[PDB]
Amino acid sequence: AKEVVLLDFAAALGWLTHPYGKGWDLMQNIMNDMPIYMYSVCNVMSGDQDNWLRTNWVYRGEAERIFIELKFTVRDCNSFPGGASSCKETFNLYYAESDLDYGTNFQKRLFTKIDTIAPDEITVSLNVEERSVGPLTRKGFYLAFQDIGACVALLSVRVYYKKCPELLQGLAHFPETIAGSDAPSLATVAGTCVDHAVVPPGGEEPRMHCAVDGEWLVPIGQCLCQAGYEKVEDACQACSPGFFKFEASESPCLECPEHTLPSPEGATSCECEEGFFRAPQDPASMPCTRPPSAPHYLTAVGMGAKVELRWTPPQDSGGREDIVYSVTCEQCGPCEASVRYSEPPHGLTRTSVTVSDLEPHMNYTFTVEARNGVSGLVTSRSFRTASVSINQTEPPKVRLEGRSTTSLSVSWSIPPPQQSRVWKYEVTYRKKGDSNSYNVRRTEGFSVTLDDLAPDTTYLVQVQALTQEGQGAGSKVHEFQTLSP
Ligand SMILES: *[C@H]1O[C@H](CO)[C@@H](O)[C@H](O)[C@H]1NC(C)=O
Ligand SMILES: [Cl-]
């Protein structure tokens, strides 16, 4: 775990002693053909000791919490001739922040005690200890060591801050970040997106925290490979030629779908080969599709004035499920509003419709076309046709125009446009009650007189305009009556 050092006594500076002369004092020994320095003080006999040793001004840089490591020795208070109660076996560690170098202007009251330092190993004619303080927030700081009446040898001091390693995590890159001072107040570090990577709409953007111990803590958000690109190891390559990636996801590059042209490197979509198309609604994931073929077959059986257009889906959906049917009509020329559709005629999803109100004696032709969500792209037409004529025309209006004791003058009417079909007019009559005797005569006229009948009798008259045989339209059964003398 990287550590940045701000002050290292061992490598070596002549620090400030107070008071000067007595108290702390730089000293030297010999080892491995090399000089060894140390600040010592051994005033155990003397009743009251208050010896201060101050380190020169250390720059804080951007360090937030510093770690102080000390290596020292301590003699046993029981080994000195005096060795009275005036001998301690510990010393005190202080610090102070400032924006300028006080130089020689050392002032005890300005210092904050960090802790007392006690020997792990006491000797008789080396203890290692570490502490830390934060947060620091000024240009520089001092360290101060206080003697209270012991025999101490200070061999080493190191003050450093911990640091978080640079890394790449989820396509994001974070840089060396100074570790934080306190956990409850841990800042957040933004990461930047590797080439060809991005943060999608709208996920969390890359973040991570540098903990006191110099460790990366809680990873937030992530970067994904931009469209046209895919993740390989910890980088983003372009999609191979023949593949595509429309949205920035975690998935790999997909191969082009059906009916598409081989894509160039780093493709976000495969264009569709001539003959096929895609709708706006269509995702670039589905294959380009085609317009449908006309309905497979079409029937139109007309029960009276209504009719039943049944039909079946195209033999070729064009590769879609959004096929809708449209129905028009011929009467020549287009039908008016005269015809009623059981349902709206255009934009149908069913495969059968009932139209009604068809004036007899006219064959209409209905056309049904099938189209899908891609028909609007081409100007062709794919439809089926079916025609029907109802011959039932038309319930004649009967009424009399003359009466006698024995004869009835009967006449019927019917619009000229329909007087064409009518092959012959069948006239039927019989006395009331009688059901074993029928009187029937035919004619092309619109009037007839019934001869040789009984007086004061109601007759049943039924006229039927045949078209041509057994397929004609009957009339209301009227009731007329002879006259009395
Ligand atoms: C419909 O009338 C036409 C004349 O427009 C005729 O050719 C045809 O036979 C009729 N319908 C049928 C059942 O063929
Ligand atoms: Cl602290």
From Swiss-Prot:
Changing R75E: Significantly reduced response to EFNA1. Glycans are attached at N363, N391. It comes from the Eukaryota. GO terms for cellular component: cell surface; focal adhesion; lamellipodium; lamellipodium membrane; leading edge membrane; plasma membrane; receptor complex; ruffle membrane. Expressed in brain and glioma tissue and glioma cell lines (at protein level). Expressed most highly in tissues that contain a high proportion of epithelial cells, e.g. skin, intestine, lung, and ovary. Residues 2-485 are extracellular. Autophosphorylates. Phosphorylated on tyrosine upon binding and activation by EFNA1. These phosphorylated residues are critical for recruitment of VAV2 and VAV3 and PI3-kinase p85 subunit which transduce downstream signaling to activate RAC1 GTPase and cell migration. Ubiquitinated by CHIP/STUB1. Ubiquitination is regulated by the HSP90 chaperone and regulates the receptor stability and activity through proteasomal degradation. ANKS1A prevents ubiquitination and degradation. One of its GO terms (biological process) is skeletal system development. Residues 291-388, 394-485 form the Fibronectin type-III domain. Residues 2-169 are annotated as: Mediates interaction with CLDN4. Keywords: Angiogenesis, Apoptosis, ATP-binding, Cataract, Cell adhesion, Cell junction, Cell membrane, Cell projection, Differentiation, Disease variant, Disulfide bond, Glycoprotein, Host cell receptor for virus entry, Host-virus interaction, Kinase, Membrane, Nucleotide-binding, Phosphoprotein, Receptor, Repeat, Signal, Transferase, Transmembrane, Transmembrane helix, Tyrosine-protein kinase, Ubl conjugation. It is found in: Cell membrane; Cell projection, Ruffle membrane; Cell projection, Lamellipodium membrane; Cell junction, Focal adhesion. Residues 3-169 form the Eph LBD domain. GO terms for molecular function: ATP binding; cadherin binding; ephrin receptor activity; growth factor binding; molecular function activator activity; transmembrane receptor protein tyrosine kinase activity; virus receptor activity. Induction: Up-regulated by UV irradiation via a TP53-independent, MAPK-dependent mechanism. It is linked to Cataract 6, multiple types: An opacification of the crystalline lens of the eye that frequently results in visual impairment or blindness. Opacities vary in morphology, are often confined to a portion of the lens, and may be static or progressive. CTRCT6 includes posterior polar and age-related cortical cataracts, among others. Posterior polar cataract is a subcapsular opacity, usually disk-shaped, located at the back of the lens. Age-related cortical cataract is a developmental punctate opacity restricted to the cortex. Overexpressed in several cancer types and promotes malignancy. Homodimer. Interacts with SLA. Interacts (phosphorylated form) with VAV2, VAV3 and PI3-kinase p85 subunit (PIK3R1, PIK3R2 or PIK3R3); critical for the EFNA1-induced activation of RAC1 which stimulates cell migration. Interacts with INPPL1; regulates activated EPHA2 endocytosis and degradation. Interacts (inactivated form) with PTK2/FAK1 and interacts (EFNA1 ligand-activated form) with PTPN11; regulates integrin-mediated adhesion. Interacts with ARHGEF16, DOCK4 and ELMO2; mediates ligand-independent activation of RAC1 which stimulates cell migration. (Microbial infection) Interacts with human herpes virus 8/HHV-8 glycoprotein L/gL and glycoprotein H/gH heterodimer; this interaction triggers EPHA2 phosphorylation and endocytosis, allowing virus entry. Belongs to the protein kinase superfamily. Tyr protein kinase family. Ephrin receptor subfamily. Receptor tyrosine kinase which binds promiscuously membrane-bound ephrin-A family ligands residing on adjacent cells, leading to contact-dependent bidirectional signaling into neighboring cells. The signaling pathway downstream of the receptor is referred to as forward signaling while the signaling pathway downstream of the ephrin ligand is referred to as reverse signaling. Activated by the ligand ephrin-A1/EFNA1 regulates migration, integrin-mediated adhesion, proliferation and differentiation of cells. (Microbial infection) Acts as a receptor for hepatitis C virus (HCV) in hepatocytes and facilitates its cell entry. Mediates HCV entry by promoting the formation of the CD81-CLDN1 receptor complexes that are essential for HCV entry and by enhancing membrane fusion of cells expressing HCV envelope glycoproteins. This is Ephrin type-A receptor 2. The lineage of its organism: Eukaryota, Metazoa, Chordata, Craniata, Vertebrata. The gene is EPHA2. The chain holds residues 27 to 529 of 976 of the full protein.
